[PDB]
């Protein structure tokens, strides 16, 4: 009841080294949006860095 | 009693010396058999063989014993107390019946299975034929 | 020339699916197009999904 | 001859009449699929005579009409359901079977 | 039910023939999914033909458009009913209203 | 050095629903963990709903039973709404017997040693005569999500209801500003859930965090078989042990199981150690099955 | 019909919004300012487009 | 993913003991055994089937119901108890 489908990233189809396109499959129904939204808000809002 | 099987009993080209009665029993199961996976477990090879009848209605059995095997056929001394202790130990008393499939209008009930049973009878006959000799200096052609 | 008539009543239970037609009482028709999950629905500041 | 609407027929399978009773008509309550058998019905075909080949197969059954065929009612392909009510009407003179 | 109706639902429900309107008012005696028994009040009652009415409801049967014309009893037991009043809701009705 | 959320207060304000509280959070993580845990809690939580019902004198679910003022279909809906906890089983069979005028509440079920009804005032149906009694068997099992009847019964007396294995109803988070701990721009995440009594709230938030951290776990012809047995780096005895069974290629050694080789005394004790040393590279004796010799890469040209 | 409403609401302007009159080094950080919650979808701005 | 994972590390025989009336069979099958003052199926397992067949309180259909119950082999298997309790059935 706890063992879902657990994914692994199937390919990293990348253009030049500061740009990439990373896919993920298979995810349980409705989890694509929650992982996309969690990773999107964490990357776009709060990362460590210098400028 | 339409005396339909009576005339068929003595066909008897290749089933003359063979177990005539047994062949009819097999044919009855082929018609009532073949596609019979309902009821309780399976079919019923055993059947009250009534020569006069011809179409021995598929009868079941109860097989009086003293153990707890084969659920369908299970009788005991304590279970035979309702019939005023009329049942013994190791008796194959029958107390159930079954059904067949129309008449001769339904060909394939026993037709493929009828031939299948016929085939089984033929296999038994061939075994008996080979047992008659039981190994001899006979020839043959490849 | 008929012997006997057998009539049998099947009782299907048809639920809802993408493709049925729903409509209000004013002419707002529509083919229901996607049966979303519960979580994707716009909710308000109480908690209830629409 | 007339038709026969009893149990199965030939050309059947445990899946051909595992939901029918001993007289062809499906039970009241049997939840069926699309394409099962509800009423089993066999009709006649060739009359011919008495073939020498299957002399013990065309006489044992006692079919002097025969060669019956298969024309059973089936659920039309696509619909499920649950059989809730069965009516049987009999033209007077005809033998009522056990379910009627 | 309709939350926003026009008050015209009771005329369309009662003045059609899908609900089981009480003929003589009184006290309910036996409610069941099959039948409903009304005991007729004494100030509405004939001298002869002693009289307690039985409403045999119409359970699951086929309509013309292959819907399911059901009747459900909506009264409790021991409950008073008046002359001209719903006892059994029909298809797409609720307490005598019209719920499509 | 991000501040980590820790559960602080579980206000069980009513019996169904509670208000768990997470504190502290850096700015931005409030809406992130709020939407994430809301979507996990509504999506997939282990519930304990009902699957099969067998009323005694009822053939199909569209019939009517003599002496109960609701249909069998309405009894199935009222049993579909049954809120029940199970403790140490996969599935369980509850038994109901009731006779007499009046309601059949949900507290009339003969409870087992682990099943616990959480709302015993739940009405199922109304018996309406002095000798008219229902007697049913109910089947309650674990699950996840919504498993209807059309996807998944063998006799004609079973009745299949739909299965809404879902304990929660309404999950609402409300982020808000945080006081001392001597630092501003911190947030508090207050989640008011709405359970039906079958799931503890801290257990719900713990299973949701476990599911989400499990989801982020994703990123946070053999040349030895084609070669001869004698071509191996080991001694000639290790090759001869396999070759005694008329084997010339290691593909034939991979075609046969190691248990089948151990059931023959042609191999020795030191030959078993040599076979283990050869299988440590995992190129041979990996328990495979070939057609006879050739794989697809081993093709005839 | 829906898509022209989405465009007409997107490419429009209002005389004051979040991020009125700030300057942006490209359209990529224009979408990044819209998504993070620092500007509005219609707020007049000097960008550098190529 | 490392940031989001570090923000979550602070979270992550019963047939014999049952009554004869509790059996799936009809009330007559239970009443046949209950006529000999038996309330639990453990009392039915304590007595032999031959001893029950020597009493006319059970009927012919009750014998078939007893056979259907004993087909699961949970009751009427010819056992002998102390009086009621096995070791797993202990008083606490």
Residue G48 to residue G26: CA distance in whole angstroms: 5
Is the N-terminal amide bond of A26 cis, ω within 30° of 0? yes
Give contacts of H70 with chain B, Cβ < 8 Å: 68
- Contacting partners of chain A (3+ CB pairs under 8 A): C, F, G, H
Residue at D99 is within a domain = no
Residues F79 and F65 in one domain: yes
Q: Please tell me what DSSP assigns to residue F185.
A: S
User: Distance between CA atoms of H66 and H74, rounded to whole angstroms?
Assistant: 11
Q: Helix H segments across chain B?
A: 5-9, 20-32, 108-133
Q: Give A39's contacts in chain H (Cβ within 8 Å).
A: 1, 4
Tokens 């850096």 identify what position?
A: F26
Please give the full DSSP string across G1-50, using - where no structure is assigned. Answer: -HHHHHHHHHS---SS-TTTT-EES-HHHHHHHHHHTSS-SS---EE---
* Rounded Cα gap, residues E61 and D85, in angstroms: 9
Are F120 and F67 part of one and the same domain? Answer: yes
**Is A30 near chain F, with CB under 8 Å?**
yes
Please count the CA atoms within 13 angstroms of the CA of F174 that sit on its side-chain side: 8
Reduce the DSSP state of residue F247 to 3 states and report it: coil
Chain centroid, CA B13 distance in Å: 21
CA–CA separation, D5 vs D3, rounded Å?
A: 7
Interface of H with F (CB under 8 A): 1-12, 22, 24
Domain that includes residue B19, residue range: 4-128
CA contacts within 13 A on the Cβ side of C42 = 0
Q: Please state, in angstroms and rounded to a whole number, the distance separating the CA atoms of residues G39 and F168.
A: 36
Q: What CA–CA distances, in Å, run from D12 to B35, B109, D17, D67? A: 6, 8, 7, 15
Closest among D66, D9, D99 to B101, alpha carbons compared:
D9
CB atoms within 10 A of CB F205: 21
C39 touches chain A (CB under 8 A): yes
Exposed, middle or buried, D40 (CB in 10 Å: 0-12/13-18/19+)? Answer: buried
CA distance F285 to chain C (A): 49
Total of domains in chain D: 1
Among all residues of chain C, which has the CA nearest to that of A31? C39
Decide if F5 and H24 are in contact by the 8 Å CB cutoff: no
Q: What is the rounded CA–CA span in Å between residue B117 and residue B63? A: 25
| Token representation of residue F270 | 């030191």
User: What's the start-to-end Cα distance of chain E, in Å?
Assistant: 8
Q: Are B31 and B114 in contact (CB under 8 A)?
A: yes
Contact F148, F163 (CB under 8 A): yes
Q: Which residues of B touch H67 (CB under 8 A)?
A: 71, 74, 79
Query: For the domain that residue F198 is a member of, what is the CATH number?
Result: 3.30.1360.10
Q: What is the 3-state secondary structure (H, E, C) of chain F?
A: CCCCCEECCCECCCCCCCEEEEEEEECCHHHHHHHHHHHHHHHCCEECCEEEEEECCCCCCCCCCCCECCCHHHHHHHHHCCCEECCCCCEEEEEEEEECCEEEEHHHEECCCCCEECCCCCEEEEECCCCCEEEEEEEEECEEEEECCCCCCCCCCCEECCEEECCECCCEEEEEECCCCCCCCEEEEEEECCECCCCCHHHHHHHHHHHHHHHHHHCCCCHHHHCEHHHCCCCHHHHHHHHCCCCCEHHHHHHCCHHHHHCCCCCCHHHHHHHHHHHCCCCCCCCCCCCCCCCCCCCCC
The residue numbers preceding gaps of C to N over 2.5 A in chain H are 12
Q: Do residues F28 and F111 share a domain?
A: no
User: Could you tell me if residue F300 is inside a domain?
Assistant: no
**Nearest alpha-carbon partner for E73 in E89, E95, E49, E61:** E89
For residue E37, give both structure tokens.
């028994």
E80, β-bridge pairs: E27
Same domain, F170 and F42: yes
> What's the token pair of residue F125?
């149906």
Which residues lie closer than 8 Å to B111 by C-beta, 6 or more apart? Answer: B30, D10, D57
Structural domain of F99: 47-165
Picking from B70, H43, B64, the residue whose alpha carbon sits closest to that of residue H51 is H43
Domain that holds residue D63: 1-94
Phi-psi region of E92 (alpha: psi -120 to 50; beta: other; left: phi over 0): left
For residue E48, the number of C-alpha atoms closer than 13 Å in the C-beta half-sphere is: 0
CB G45 within 8 A of CB G22: yes
CB F26 within 8 Å of CB F3 = yes
Got the DSSP string for D33-89?
-TT-EEE--B---------STTTTTSSSS--SS-------EE--TT--EEEEEEEEE
Q: With the CA atoms of E42, E46, E52 and E53 taken in that order, what torsion angle do they form, in degrees rounded to the nearest 10?
A: -120
Residues 6+ apart with CB under 8 A from C23: C29, C30
Cβ atoms of B109 and B58 closer than 8 Å: no
Rounded Cα distance, F61 and F158, in Å:
9
Residue F70 belongs to some domain of the structure:
yes
Resolution limit in angstroms? Answer: 6.0
Q: CATH number for the domain including F231?
A: 1.10.150.20
Which of 113-152 (F) contact D at CB < 8 A?
150
Classify residue D100: in a domain, yes or no.
no
A 1-40 residues with CB < 8 A to C: 29-30, 33
Q: Identify whether residues F77 and F153 lie together within a single domain.
A: yes
Q: Are F37 and F213 in contact (CB under 8 A)?
A: no
Question: What's the helix, strand, coil split of chain H in %, to 5?
Answer: 45, 0, 50
Give the pairing type, strands F172-177 and F186-192.
antiparallel
**Among D87, D92, D91, residue whose Cα is nearest residue D25:** D87
Answer yes or no: do F176 and F161 share one domain.
Answer: no
Print burial letters for E23-46: b (CB count within 10 Å at least 16), e (below 16). Answer: ebbbebebbbbbebbbebeeeeee
In a mutagenesis test of the C interface, which of A30, A32, A35 is the best target, namely the one with the most C β-carbons within 10 Å? A30
Which CATH number goes with the domain that contains D18?
A: 2.40.50.150
Do the strands G46-47 and G23-24 form a parallel or antiparallel pair, or are they unpaired? parallel
* Pairing of β F6-7 and β F19-26: antiparallel
Comparing CA positions, the residue from E7, E71, D54, H7 lying closest to residue F220 is H7
Joined tokens for residue E17: 């023939």
- Gap between the Cα atoms of F171 and F212, Å rounded: 17
Q: Is residue D17 part of a domain?
A: yes
Pairwise CA distance, residues E50 & F264, whole Å: 99
Is the previous residue joined to F24 through a cis bond, with omega within 30 degrees of 0? yes
Q: Which fold has domain E18-92?
A: OB fold (Dihydrolipoamide Acetyltransferase, E2P) (2.40.50)
Q: Alpha-carbon distance F299 to F221, whole Å? A: 9
Tokens of D49: 């005579």
Say whether residue C23 is in contact with chain E using an 8 A CB cutoff: no
Q: Which of F91, F222, F212, F229 is nearest to F163 (CA)?
A: F91
The label of the residue with tokens 């465009």 reads G7
D37-39 vs D31-32, strand pairing mode: unpaired
Please indicate whether chains C and A are in contact, defined as at least 3 beta carbon pairs under 8 Å.
yes
From the number of C-beta atoms within 10 Å of its C-beta (0-12, 13-18, 19+), residue F102 rates as exposed
Indicate which CATH number applies to the domain containing F77: 2.170.120.12
- DSSP conformation letters of B33-86: SSS---SSS---S-----TTTSS---B----B-SSS-STTS-B-TTTTTTTTS-
Residue E62 at interface with chain C, using a CB cutoff of 8 Å: yes
F172–C46 CB contact, under 8 Å: yes
The Cα D91–Cα E26 span in angstroms is 46
Q: Say how far apart CA F99 and CA F68 lie, in whole Å.
A: 11
Distances from the Cα of G40 to the Cα of A43, F30, G3, G11, G33, angstroms: 20, 22, 19, 11, 8
Which method resolved this structure? cryo-EM
> In this structure, which long-range contacts are made by residues F106-112, counting pairs with CB atoms below 8 Å and at least 24 apart in sequence?
F106/F82, F109/F138, F110/H22
User: Cα(D20)–Cα(D40) distance, rounded to whole angstroms?
Assistant: 8
CA-angle at F113, arms to F109 and F115, nearest 5°? 55
| F132, F84 contact by CB (below 8 A) | no
């Amino acid at each position: 009841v706890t063992e879902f489908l657990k994914p692994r990233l199937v390919d990293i189809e990348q253009v030049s080294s500061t740009h990439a396109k990373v896919t993920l499959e298979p995810l349980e129904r409705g989890f694509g949006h929650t992982l996309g939204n969690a990773l999107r808000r964490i990357l776009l809002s709060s990362m460590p860095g210098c400028a | 009693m339409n005396k339909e099987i009576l005339a068929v009993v003595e066909a008897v080209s290749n089933e003359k010396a063979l177990p005539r009665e047994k062949i009819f029993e097999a044919l009855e199961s082929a018609l009532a058999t073949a596609t019979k996976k309902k009821y309780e477990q399976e079919i019923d090879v055993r059947v009250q063989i009534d020569r006069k009848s011809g179409d021995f209605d598929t009868f079941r059995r109860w097989l009086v014993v003293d153990e707890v095997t084969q659920p369908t056929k299970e009788i005991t001394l304590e279970a035979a107390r309702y019939e005023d202790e009329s049942l013994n130990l190791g008796d194959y008393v029958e107390d159930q019946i079954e059904s067949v499939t129309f008449d001769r209008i339904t060909t394939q009930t026993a037709k493929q299975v009828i031939v299948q049973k016929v085939r089984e009878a033929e296999r038994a006959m061939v075994v008996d034929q080979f047992r008659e000799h039981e190994g001899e200096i006979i020839t043959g052609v490849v | 020339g008929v012997l006997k008539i057998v009539k049998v009543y099947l009782a299907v239970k048809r639920r809802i699916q993408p493709g049925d037609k729903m409509a209000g009482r004013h002419g707002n028709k529509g083919v229901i197009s996607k049966i979303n999950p519960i979580e994707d629905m716009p909710y308000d500041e109480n908690g209830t999904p629409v | 001859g007339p038709e026969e609407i009893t149990a199965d027929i030939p050309n059947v399978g445990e899946a051909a009449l595992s939901k029918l009773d001993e007289s062809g008509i499906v039970y009241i309550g049997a939840e069926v699929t699309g394409g099962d058998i509800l009423v089993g019905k066999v009709t006649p075909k060739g009359e011919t005579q008495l073939t020498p080949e299957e002399k013990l197969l065309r006489a044992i059954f006692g079919e002097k009409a025969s060669d019956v065929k298969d024309s059973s009612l089936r659920v039309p392909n696509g619909v499920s359901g649950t059989v809730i009510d069965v009516q049987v009407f009999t033209r007077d003179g005809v033998e009522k079977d056990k379910r009627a | 039910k309709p939350l926003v109706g026009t008050g015209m639902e009771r005329a369309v429900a009662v003045d059609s023939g899908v609900t089981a309107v009480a003929k003589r008012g009184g006290v309910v005696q036996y409610v069941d999914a099959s039948r409903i028994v009304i005991k007729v009040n004494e100030d509405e009652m004939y001298p002869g033909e002693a009289g307690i009415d039985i409403y045999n409801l119409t359970k699951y049967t086929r309509s013309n458009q292959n819907t399911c014309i059901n009747q459900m009893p909506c009264v409790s037991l021991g409950e008073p009913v008046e002359r001209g009043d719903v006892l059994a809701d029909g298809p797409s009705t609720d307490l005598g209203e019209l719920a499509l | 050095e991000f501040l980590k959320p820790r559960l602080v207060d579980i206000e069980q304000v009513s019996s169904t629903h509670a208000k768990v509280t997470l504190e502290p959070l850096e700015r931005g993580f409030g809406h992130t963990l709020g939407n994430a845990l809301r979507r996990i809690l509504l999506s997939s939580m282990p519930g304990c709903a009902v699957t099969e019902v067998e009323i005694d004198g009822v053939l199909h679910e569209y019939s009517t039973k003599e002496g109960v003022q609701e249909d069998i279909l309405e009894i199935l809906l009222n049993l579909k709404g049954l809120a029940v906890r199970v403790q140490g089983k996969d599935e369980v069979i509850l038994t109901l017997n009731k006779s007499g005028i009046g309601p059949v509440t949900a507290a009339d079920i003969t409870h087992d040693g682990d099943v616990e009804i959480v709302k015993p005032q739940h009405v199922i149906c109304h018996l309406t005569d002095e000798n008219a009694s229902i007697s049913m068997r109910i089947k309650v099992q674990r699950g996840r999500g919504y498993v209807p009847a059309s996807t998944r019964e063998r006799p004609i007396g079973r009745l299949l209801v739909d299965a809404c294995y879902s304990p929660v109803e309404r999950i609402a988070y409300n982020v808000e500003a945080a006081r001392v701990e001597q630092r501003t721009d911190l947030d508090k995440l207050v989640i008011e859930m709405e359970t039906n009594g079958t799931i503890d709230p801290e257990e719900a938030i713990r299973r949701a965090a476990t599911i989400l951290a499990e989801q982020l776990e994703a990123f946070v012809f053999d040349p030895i078989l084609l070669r001869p047995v004698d071509d191996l780096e080991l001694t000639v005895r290790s090759a001869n042990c396999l070759k005694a069974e008329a084997i010339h290629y290691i593909g034939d050694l991979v075609q046969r199981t190691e248990v089948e080789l151990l059931k023959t005394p042609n191999l020795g004790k030191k030959s078993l150690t040599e076979i283990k040393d050869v299988l440590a590279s995992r190129g041979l004796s990996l328990g495979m099955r070939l057609e006879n010799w050739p794989p697809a890469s081993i093709a005839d040209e | 019909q829906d898509v022209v409403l989405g465009l007409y609401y997107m490419t429009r302007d209002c005389v004051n919004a979040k991020g009125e009159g700030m300057v942006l080094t490209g359209p990529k950080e224009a979408e990044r300012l819209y998504r993070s919650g620092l500007a509005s979808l219609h707020a007049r701005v000097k960008v550098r487009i190529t």
